Design an enzyme around this catalytic site. Sequence first.
Site, PDB file in Angstrom:
ATOM      1  N   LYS A 155      34.436  36.759  66.508  1.00 30.36           N
ATOM      2  CA  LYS A 155      34.812  35.470  64.849  1.00 30.36           C
ATOM      3  C   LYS A 155      36.037  34.176  64.557  1.00 30.36           C
ATOM      4  O   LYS A 155      36.775  34.780  66.119  1.00 30.36           O
ATOM      5  CB  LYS A 155      35.839  36.478  63.468  1.00 30.36           C
ATOM      6  CG  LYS A 155      36.527  37.446  64.117  1.00 30.36           C
ATOM      7  CD  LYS A 155      37.697  37.085  63.302  1.00 30.36           C
ATOM      8  CE  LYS A 155      38.787  37.848  63.446  1.00 30.36           C
ATOM      9  NZ  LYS A 155      40.709  36.822  63.344  1.00 30.36           N
ATOM     10  N   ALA A 181      39.011  39.374  75.591  1.00 28.74           N
ATOM     11  CA  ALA A 181      40.662  39.315  75.472  1.00 28.74           C
ATOM     12  C   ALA A 181      40.833  37.762  74.929  1.00 28.74           C
ATOM     13  O   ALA A 181      41.655  36.732  74.987  1.00 28.74           O
ATOM     14  CB  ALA A 181      41.824  39.602  76.385  1.00 28.74           C
ATOM     15  N   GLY A 194      41.066  37.024  71.125  1.00 28.19           N
ATOM     16  CA  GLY A 194      41.106  36.431  69.856  1.00 28.19           C
ATOM     17  C   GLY A 194      39.866  36.066  68.990  1.00 28.19           C
ATOM     18  O   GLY A 194      39.776  36.594  67.498  1.00 28.19           O
ATOM     19  N   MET A 195      38.842  37.064  69.314  1.00 28.94           N
ATOM     20  CA  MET A 195      37.547  36.247  68.616  1.00 28.94           C
ATOM     21  C   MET A 195      36.938  38.294  68.086  1.00 28.94           C
ATOM     22  O   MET A 195      36.132  38.802  67.862  1.00 28.94           O
ATOM     23  CB  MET A 195      36.151  36.353  69.225  1.00 28.94           C
ATOM     24  CG  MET A 195      36.664  34.400  69.996  1.00 28.94           C
ATOM     25  SD  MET A 195      35.020  34.202  69.833  1.00 28.94           S
ATOM     26  CE  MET A 195      34.142  34.232  68.872  1.00 28.94           C
ATOM     27  N   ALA A 196      38.336  39.253  68.382  1.00 28.43           N
ATOM     28  CA  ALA A 196      37.902  40.927  67.944  1.00 28.43           C
ATOM     29  C   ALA A 196      36.918  41.268  68.159  1.00 28.43           C
ATOM     30  O   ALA A 196      36.133  41.670  67.469  1.00 28.43           O
ATOM     31  CB  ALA A 196      38.427  40.557  66.319  1.00 28.43           C
ATOM     32  N   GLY A 197      36.157  41.493  69.733  1.00 28.58           N
ATOM     33  CA  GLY A 197      34.939  41.467  70.458  1.00 28.58           C
ATOM     34  C   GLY A 197      35.708  43.712  69.694  1.00 28.58           C
ATOM     35  O   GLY A 197      34.533  44.441  69.868  1.00 28.58           O
ATOM     36  N   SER A 249      36.789  45.317  67.810  1.00 27.15           N
ATOM     37  CA  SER A 249      36.506  45.277  66.435  1.00 27.15           C
ATOM     38  C   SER A 249      35.012  45.148  65.769  1.00 27.15           C
ATOM     39  O   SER A 249      35.139  45.935  65.270  1.00 27.15           O
ATOM     40  CB  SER A 249      37.128  44.735  65.841  1.00 27.15           C
ATOM     41  OG  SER A 249      38.556  45.045  65.423  1.00 27.15           O
ATOM     42  N   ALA A 250      34.550  44.456  66.760  1.00 33.57           N
ATOM     43  CA  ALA A 250      33.243  44.334  65.974  1.00 33.57           C
ATOM     44  C   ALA A 250      32.162  45.201  66.906  1.00 33.57           C
ATOM     45  O   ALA A 250      31.433  45.864  65.891  1.00 33.57           O
ATOM     46  CB  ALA A 250      32.540  42.919  67.430  1.00 33.57           C
ATOM     47  N   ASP A 280      40.496  44.435  62.106  1.00 30.11           N
ATOM     48  CA  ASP A 280      39.579  43.198  61.592  1.00 30.11           C
ATOM     49  C   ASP A 280      38.367  43.810  61.725  1.00 30.11           C
ATOM     50  O   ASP A 280      37.336  43.704  62.099  1.00 30.11           O
ATOM     51  CB  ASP A 280      39.279  42.349  63.150  1.00 30.11           C
ATOM     52  CG  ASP A 280      40.297  41.037  63.208  1.00 30.11           C
ATOM     53  OD1 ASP A 280      41.004  41.175  61.996  1.00 30.11           O
ATOM     54  OD2 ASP A 280      40.793  40.992  63.720  1.00 30.11           O
TER      55      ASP A 280
HETATM   56  N1  LIG Z   1      46.741  47.379  65.553  1.00 33.37           N
HETATM   57  C1  LIG Z   1      46.392  47.757  66.728  1.00 33.37           C
HETATM   58  N2  LIG Z   1      46.746  46.842  68.184  1.00 33.37           N
HETATM   59  C2  LIG Z   1      46.669  46.340  69.141  1.00 33.37           C
HETATM   60  N3  LIG Z   1      45.293  45.835  69.325  1.00 33.37           N
HETATM   61  C3  LIG Z   1      44.061  45.910  68.504  1.00 33.37           C
HETATM   62  C4  LIG Z   1      44.827  46.909  67.511  1.00 33.37           C
HETATM   63  N4  LIG Z   1      43.727  46.609  66.175  1.00 33.37           N
HETATM   64  C5  LIG Z   1      42.503  46.110  66.851  1.00 33.37           C
HETATM   65  N5  LIG Z   1      42.820  45.305  68.392  1.00 33.37           N
HETATM   66  C6  LIG Z   1      42.252  45.106  68.934  1.00 33.37           C
HETATM   67  O1  LIG Z   1      41.281  44.462  69.267  1.00 33.37           O
HETATM   68  C7  LIG Z   1      40.557  44.614  70.234  1.00 33.37           C
HETATM   69  C8  LIG Z   1      39.136  43.085  70.276  1.00 33.37           C
HETATM   70  O2  LIG Z   1      39.563  42.934  72.088  1.00 33.37           O
HETATM   71  P1  LIG Z   1      38.630  41.268  72.151  1.00 33.37           P
HETATM   72  O3  LIG Z   1      37.677  40.850  71.247  1.00 33.37           O
HETATM   73  O4  LIG Z   1      37.866  41.310  73.786  1.00 33.37           O
HETATM   74  O5  LIG Z   1      40.172  40.402  72.127  1.00 33.37           O
HETATM   75  P2  LIG Z   1      40.856  40.000  70.654  1.00 33.37           P
HETATM   76  O6  LIG Z   1      41.225  41.238  70.707  1.00 33.37           O
HETATM   77  O7  LIG Z   1      41.868  38.951  71.604  1.00 33.37           O
HETATM   78  O8  LIG Z   1      40.075  39.360  70.060  1.00 33.37           O
HETATM   79  C9  LIG Z   1      41.222  45.155  71.536  1.00 33.37           C
HETATM   80  O9  LIG Z   1      40.857  44.860  72.514  1.00 33.37           O
HETATM   81  C10 LIG Z   1      42.121  46.126  70.858  1.00 33.37           C
HETATM   82  O10 LIG Z   1      43.336  45.096  71.969  1.00 33.37           O
END
Ligand SMILES: Nc1ncnc2c1ncn2[C@@H]1O[C@H](COP(=O)(O)OP(=O)(O)O)[C@@H](O)[C@H]1O
Length: 298
Positions: free
Chosen positions: A10, A97, A99-102, A104-105, A137
């Site tokens: 996202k 890493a 910021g697109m929350a992979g 969580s996806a 997310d």
């Molecule tokens: N409470 C939380 N604290 C830290 N990280 C979280 C938490 N909830 C979800 N995440 C993150 O969701 C991330 C999904 O990673 P990714 O999309 O590859 O990079 P990004 O996290 O920057 O969007 C995981 O690396 C994890 O760090």
Amino acid sequence: GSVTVRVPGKVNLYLAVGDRREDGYHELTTVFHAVSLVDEVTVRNADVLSLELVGEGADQLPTDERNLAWQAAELMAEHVGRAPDVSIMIDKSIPVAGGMAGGSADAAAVLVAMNSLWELNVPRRDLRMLAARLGSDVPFALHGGTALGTGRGEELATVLSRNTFHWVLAFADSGLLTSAVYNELDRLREVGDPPRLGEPGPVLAALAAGDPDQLAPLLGNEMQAAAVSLDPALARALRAGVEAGALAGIVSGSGPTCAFLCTSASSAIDVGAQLSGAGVCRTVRVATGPVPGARVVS
Ligand SMILES: Nc1ncnc2c1ncn2[C@@H]1O[C@H](COP(=O)(O)OP(=O)(O)O)[C@@H](O)[C@H]1O
């Protein structure tokens, strides 16, 4: 038999961050927008829970309990009183890493894939409750499309668009620590008046109309001043993308990833080519949105 589920990463089109309180929470209002950078997660019955990832940054990621996809399987199995007797293979394209929350996806994909593999159809409302426990997310990864979100524990309001939008997304290699970003946003708010966004009405209207010219100047992120203060190169990167032809650029969420709205698929390719050539970013990609949330594709 096998099920595979495609789930998107996202961007945040709009992000308002409330004033800090105790114990240091900021309420968020956000327009999440799922784009066509996706992971494909494949789940099979197996003797024991297992997890494997492949794809560009797959090497960096835990394949055990620390992985959100691993927690998703546990929680989903536990919700129906079963052992998480499944193997999970993730084909990763959402920039890690980024910021697109992979992560969580992938968690949301595992909920949907198990629902389908086990032929259970636990209701969407139960999957969203599990998403909420998993992390902030995951619900949007299940939901996808575009949605206005209004705090955590609150529903997502679906926002439909008349047309597709065309994006160029640009990635740094190191991200930014979200805690660093909040602390600095608090600081900028103690010492000045950084950008304060109006309410999301106009953003939603531009979104519903399918109109990139109307959407562009309404894109906004109250975290952006903090991110650019920590990371002064983001400011140049934003100018560069717009100089290359984007209608606007903003940092997405906590940053440092930059989202640029373009008029069309052609224009996004030109913009991307130029930004890629100008070396302000580690990686540049094109994408469209909205795209659907986690869904079975096998
Ligand atoms: N409470 C939380 N604290 C830290 N990280 C979280 C938490 N909830 C979800 N995440 C993150 O969701 C991330 C999904 O990673 P990714 O999309 O590859 O990079 P990004 O996290 O920057 O969007 C995981 O690396 C994890 O760090």
